[PDB]
Structure 1
Amino acid sequence: GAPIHDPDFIGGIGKELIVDNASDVTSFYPSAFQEHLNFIPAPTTGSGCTRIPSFDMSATHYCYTHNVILSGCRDHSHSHQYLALGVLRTTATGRIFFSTLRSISLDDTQNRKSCSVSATPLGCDMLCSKVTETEEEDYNSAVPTLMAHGRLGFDGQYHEKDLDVTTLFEDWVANYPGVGGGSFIDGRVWFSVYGGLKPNSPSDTVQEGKYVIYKRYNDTCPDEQDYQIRMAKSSYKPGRFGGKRIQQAILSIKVSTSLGEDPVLTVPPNTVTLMGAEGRILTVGTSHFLYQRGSSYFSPALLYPMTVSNKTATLHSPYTFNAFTRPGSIPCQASARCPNSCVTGVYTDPYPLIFYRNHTLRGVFGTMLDSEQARLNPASAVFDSTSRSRITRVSSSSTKAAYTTSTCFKVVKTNKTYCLSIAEISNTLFGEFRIVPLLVEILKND
């Protein structure tokens, strides 16, 4: 009898929440922040660093995890992980609360990093990278980044198995997990991923030449056409890692009593994907979406529809929201409209919230950071391809923030739609960051 959310939630997890062909996506907006049970551990010392939140939830249980670095967020020697496996429940007065059932600190010699979780029928699958050298150091590591598929079962026990990267990520130099969540689809769990591709490798050659240029809604990038093409053509090998091709990619693994069984990579064509970066594998109802961080020139939040057959996947022309920009360094700030070759941004995923009877997406929820270049002013709101709804603010004052990963669901019992935005926040006295789960109820005008 494995852990399941309370009955008030059954049928309201990971499904298409608001199907309204009439009303305007934006008429829907986030209410003020709600007080729920804060299930994400805060730093217990003045220097402790807790970052990189990853979270997924299936119709039965939810998974969560983050990074813990004793000395400070800058130290990159060792560090452990925190994992949680729980279920949603309600109080007599119908308040909701994330009730973790298994809370453990996974800490041993091995230094995992940038890990992603996903709710599977066995427990909480986690995809990790185990590093020695720094990111910069590893991208030069001719040999591909070491990876391991782990899992925290309903029994509180943890087990993992390193994946044979010398083959799996053969044509790579660096290869880390998208940090965003993974999703379970057809007995398989699909994680996002990116990293470096060994130049001139079989893999590097098919992408060689392939580019793609997504544009802003109302801003037509001036710079001549020949200029834009060439720029994009190179936006896949930024100077940050010495021209190395940072390619997107999606890994799948068979979900069974054997961790890391039947892995399979799927390297989409840059003719459709953009510069590789952190991403999340979403699943709402019957649709699937690959979220990709805006680490390149494109600023608007993206969403590449995903389809699966066999053990591989297929991306498609991305859904986009212009109001959903992210802070980033010039020439790739929040308003950037021209293809360039940078590498910045921050993880801030959009959650599919409103569809059409024809099951096409329309509205999304998530937490952006209003600010051209710096990582400031968290902001929660509903977004359509163009505009933004009334917003709710973490703070009406300038505020330091980081990764924000959202997720919505409904309490059928109290017919209400809630959204969970796990946001990295600045913190005093106890470390650099506090990973707090903001909770909002989706309300609509009249």
Structure 2
Amino acid sequence: INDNRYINGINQFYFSIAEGRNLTLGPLLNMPSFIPTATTPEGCTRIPSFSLTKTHWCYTHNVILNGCQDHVSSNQFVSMGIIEPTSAGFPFFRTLKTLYLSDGVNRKSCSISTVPGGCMMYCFVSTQPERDDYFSAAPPEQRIIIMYYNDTIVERIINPPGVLDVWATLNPGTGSGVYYLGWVLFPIYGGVIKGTSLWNNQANKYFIPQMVAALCSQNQATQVQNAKSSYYSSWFGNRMIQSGILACPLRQDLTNECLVLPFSNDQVLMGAEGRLYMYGDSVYYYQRSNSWWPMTMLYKVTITFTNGQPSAISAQNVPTQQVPRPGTGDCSATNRCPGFCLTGVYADAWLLTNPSSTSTFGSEATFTGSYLNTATQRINPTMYIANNTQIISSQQFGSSGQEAAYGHTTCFRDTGSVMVYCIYIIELSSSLLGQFQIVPFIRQVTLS
């Protein structure tokens, strides 16, 4: 279990709106990395997923032996441990167990989540190129593995209702899931078949961020028309790219009890990878900007239960225009107009301030994370702290041109020293060992 210095400083809004204005990054601190490195120049470690809870943390990433492509074989590294203070005062992520799922099943795009006594991971079995998954009417196999600290492992192939013949594909969002009221929630996304109830109920819906108007040159009618078309991809089997949540009751005999809950396309953009968070009793969702709007998308999720079962989710967006991401073509970090896009990178963000503490939801929100500071290339990894319209603190890592990819940010507080630390797990391109080196950068978020 985590040290007493951290058990009460996890999953919360650490700063008040007033304090949020005086936050700055501190120097990076050196700690023994708990994320394994590749041992060959061509080895590939990618797609991390991290979850920190009151008692412990869970971590996982995918491993490919040669290069970063391979839809036949890959292994998945899983790790778990706790946080304890060092003599210097800052955190040390103590790994207490390790697992390497290597058995022939090609588990991909996995999302992990902390659960009482262990970790619950959700993956889908890949057997062909991503694009082919969208064209095939049958969805890939879905699995959820529960790994207890007592070394018991239980993997189950799940068949949640409303998936077969509705979704051509279904993928975990790779971002961490969360344990909520006895259920494990995971972010999901995929392609929905034309003519299905979901497709019809989603017909004509669209979402346009609150700050797009002042930045977009098109008129309201044109924006609306383009926005509506952005949820359909001809490149990905003519499916409706959908975002949602997978709710699974914590059980060791899961079969069809998990529930697929799609977001209304009136509150969310085109489906993409994502992450779920817990700030106090409120659930939040991060949605990768893989569509036309290149800015960080965070939403407060309201979950509705009907007979002890999650029955519907509602999302409220924290309106911002900060922290863009590299994109291709007319969907670069500079784009501001609705239309169909299918490019971007995963770069979640953590809310250092409560969006509900302001009379108007998210009128003044502060968040931290990393982002690739460029218009179209996955280059220049840069850790930052930002508000709705500006970056108020940032430090680029390495020299310009430094390649990088995904970034997962998580913050917690030392209730002893009373400081906030954030860990920025970034996929860095390495020249020595492996294609990428996933680094758990850690530094303090100083108030002043």
With normalisation by structure 2, the TM-score equals 0.94
Change (3 A) 1:368 1:218: farther
The 8 Å contact of residues 209 and 319 in structure 2, kept in 1 or not, is answered as no
Question: Residue in 1 aligned with 2:171?
Answer: 176
- Counting matched residue pairs gives 440
CA distance in 2, matches of 1:400, 1:171: 38
Within 5 Å, give how 1:254-403 maps onto structure 2: 254-259=249-254, 262-310=257-305, 311-355=310-354, 358=357, 362-403=365-406
Corresponding letter in the other structure for 2:119: C
Match of 1:15 among 12, 17, 25: 12
Cα deviation for residue 291 of structure 1 reads 0.6
| Structure 2 residues without counterparts, runs of 5 or longer | none
Cα deviation for residue 26 of structure 1 reads 4.1
CA distance in 2, matches of 1:233, 1:270: 9
The 8 Å contact of residues 148 and 162 in structure 1, kept in 2 or not, is answered as yes
The 8 Å contact of residues 237 and 245 in structure 1, kept in 2 or not, is answered as yes
Corresponding letter in the other structure for 1:67: N
| Correspondence 1:70 to 2:65 | yes
**What's the secondary structure of 2:265's corresponding residue?**
coil
| Correspondence 1:153 to 2:148 | yes
With normalisation by structure 1, the TM-score equals 0.94
| Correspondence 1:36 to 2:31 | yes
Corresponding letter in the other structure for 2:11: G
Corresponding letter in the other structure for 2:104: T
CA distance in 2, matches of 1:413, 1:345: 39
Cα deviation for residue 217 of structure 1 reads 5.8
CA distance in 2, matches of 1:365, 1:156: 35
The 8 Å contact of residues 158 and 254 in structure 2, kept in 1 or not, is answered as no
Corresponding letter in the other structure for 1:318: N
**What's the secondary structure of 2:133's corresponding residue?**
helix
The 8 Å contact of residues 274 and 286 in structure 2, kept in 1 or not, is answered as yes
Query: What do residues 313-349 of structure 1 show as CA deviations (whole Å, max 9, x unaligned)?
Result: 4233311332211111121111211001010110000
Cα deviation for residue 303 of structure 1 reads 0.8
**What's the secondary structure of 2:17's corresponding residue?**
coil
CA distance in 1, matches of 2:356, 2:195: 46
CA distance in 2, matches of 1:48, 1:34: 27
Cα deviation for residue 91 of structure 1 reads 2.1
Return structure 1 stretches of 4+ with deviation > 6 angstroms. none
The worse-fitting range, judged by mean Cα deviation, of 317-326 and 243-252 is 317-326
Cα deviation for residue 216 of structure 1 reads 3.7
CA distance in 1, matches of 2:43, 2:312: 39
Change (3 A) 1:170 1:29: farther
The 8 Å contact of residues 216 and 337 in structure 1, kept in 2 or not, is answered as no
Within 5 Å, give how 1:110-125 maps onto structure 2: 110-125=105-120
**What's the secondary structure of 2:257's corresponding residue?**
strand
Cα deviation for residue 208 of structure 1 reads 1.4
The worse-fitting range, judged by mean Cα deviation, of 151-160 and 31-40 is 151-160
CA distance in 1, matches of 2:76, 2:319: 33
The 8 Å contact of residues 186 and 245 in structure 2, kept in 1 or not, is answered as yes
Question: Residue in 2 aligned with 1:162?
Answer: 157
The 8 Å contact of residues 47 and 70 in structure 1, kept in 2 or not, is answered as yes
CA distance in 1, matches of 2:137, 2:355: 47
CA distance in 2, matches of 1:72, 1:356: 42
Cα deviation for residue 251 of structure 1 reads 0.8
Cα deviation for residue 85 of structure 1 reads 1.1
The 8 Å contact of residues 149 and 260 in structure 1, kept in 2 or not, is answered as no
| Correspondence 1:214 to 2:209 | yes
Q: CA RMSD in A?
A: 1.8
Percent of residue pairs bearing the same amino acid type: 35
Question: Residue in 1 aligned with 2:91?
Answer: 96
**What's the secondary structure of 1:331's corresponding residue?**
helix
| Structure 1 residues without counterparts, runs of 5 or longer | none
The 8 Å contact of residues 215 and 337 in structure 1, kept in 2 or not, is answered as no
Question: Residue in 1 aligned with 2:428?
Answer: 425
Match of 1:246 among 232, 241, 248: 241
Cα deviation for residue 302 of structure 1 reads 0.7
Question: Residue in 1 aligned with 2:442?
Answer: 439
CA distance in 1, matches of 2:447, 2:161: 52
Corresponding letter in the other structure for 1:408: C
Query: What do residues 39-61 of structure 1 show as CA deviations (whole Å, max 9, x unaligned)?
Result: 00011111100000101111101
Cα deviation for residue 238 of structure 1 reads 2.5
**What's the secondary structure of 2:174's corresponding residue?**
coil
Corresponding letter in the other structure for 2:338: P
Cα deviation for residue 75 of structure 1 reads 2.4
Cα deviation for residue 215 of structure 1 reads 4.8
Cα deviation for residue 117 of structure 1 reads 0.4
Match of 1:185 among 175, 180, 189: 180
CA distance in 1, matches of 2:319, 2:31: 31
